[PDB]
Each structure stands twice: as C-alpha cells, then as structure tokens.
Write a protein that binds this ligand. Sequence first.
Ligand SMILES: Nc1nc2c(ncn2[C@@H]2O[C@H](COP(=O)(O)OP(=O)(O)O)[C@@H](O)[C@H]2O)c(=O)[nH]1
Ligand SMILES: [Mg+2]
Length: 177
Amino acid sequence: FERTKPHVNVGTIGHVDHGKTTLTAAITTVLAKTYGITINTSHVEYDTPTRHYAHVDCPGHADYVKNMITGAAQMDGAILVVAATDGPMPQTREHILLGRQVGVPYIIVFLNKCDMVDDEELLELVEMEVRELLSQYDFPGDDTPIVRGSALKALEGDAEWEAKILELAGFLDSYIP
Ligand SMILES: Nc1nc2c(ncn2[C@@H]2O[C@H](COP(=O)(O)OP(=O)(O)O)[C@@H](O)[C@H]2O)c(=O)[nH]1
Ligand SMILES: [Mg+2]
C-alpha cells in the first residue's frame, strides 16, 4: 500500500452535459498545481498526497451501463455530477440504482453549473432533489458529501472555483474508506 499508497478507482457518472468529462479534466489540473463486447472507456490517473487515483469517465450511457454491468472499471468510489442548470435527469437516477446493484459502495456528489447558478434557493433545490434520489434508490443522502463548483472555470483559470475541486479531492480522501 505504501508505493501507490492507497490505489483508488473512482467512477464518474453523469447524464449528458453535466461536465464530468470536464470535472474529470479539472481535477487533474488542480491536482498538478497544488501537489505536483466493445467497451469504450476514458482514463485518467491522479494522485492526492495520501491516495493515488485512477479515474474512469465514459463518453456515453451505453458505456456506463455496459461498463458498470460487467466488470469494466471496478468502481470503489463513484463521483457524481448533477448539474444545477437542470436537475437530476434520467441518466442520473439510472446511474444511481445501477450503482447500488453494481456494488458501488460510495457515491460522492459534485454540482456543476455554478457558473450559472445564483440562487441558494435553487441549489438547495438541486441539492435537495439529489439527496431525495440518493436515498430512495440506495445511499445515505444525508451524511453524503455534496460539492458545488464549476469544473469549467477551474481549469480555465484561477479561482475559488478551483478551490472546490480541492474539496472533491479532500472528501475523496476522507469519504472513501
Ligand atoms: N458553464 C459551464 N459549462 C460547463 C461546465 N462544465 C462543462 N460545461 C460545458 O458543457 C458542455 C458539456 O459538458 P461535458 O463535460 O462534456 O458533459 P458530459 O457529457 O457529462 O461529459 C462542454 O462542452 C463544456 O464546455 C461548467 O462547470 N460550467
Ligand atoms: Mg464524457
């Protein structure tokens, strides 16, 4: 465990537009500064000072469903992007169940479109309805980290937004046993 230092494969589940691919990109970049069948799959490896991460993001639902259903991925940690602009839409609900069956123990939720969402009243509201799916279908939903940034900003520059990706990394290290 000491070389890898604990090696963690963290699984990113969206609907179609939320920014996972984006979320996925941002995390690495942030990470670099601060520290440093047919199957279709996209892979990134990332490191916090504690854990080391392998990350999988799939261009499509079809991918998530097949990839999650067989064996592709193995996903200890599932990082979830629900985007404020919309709300949790089908692909998110589906992804949540599928996860439960899959045996995806931990889903950590990240809320993207806060480059576009001014409204504590909405956010709570995106944020509540997530909590509501998570439970009905699987998960705690209470004692479950919800992180709001905006991935797009974070790469792109400087920012407060960047900082949040840091919580995401942080929770990861914590939330995931
Ligand atoms: N404004 C804004 N747009 C975003 C953000 N993240 C992603 N997008 C944009 O929305 C489009 C779809 O996002 P994407 O990451 O590809 O979604 P995915 O299908 O879940 O992988 C992208 O081309 C991005 O330019 C974000 O945090 N803010
Ligand atoms: Mg994608």
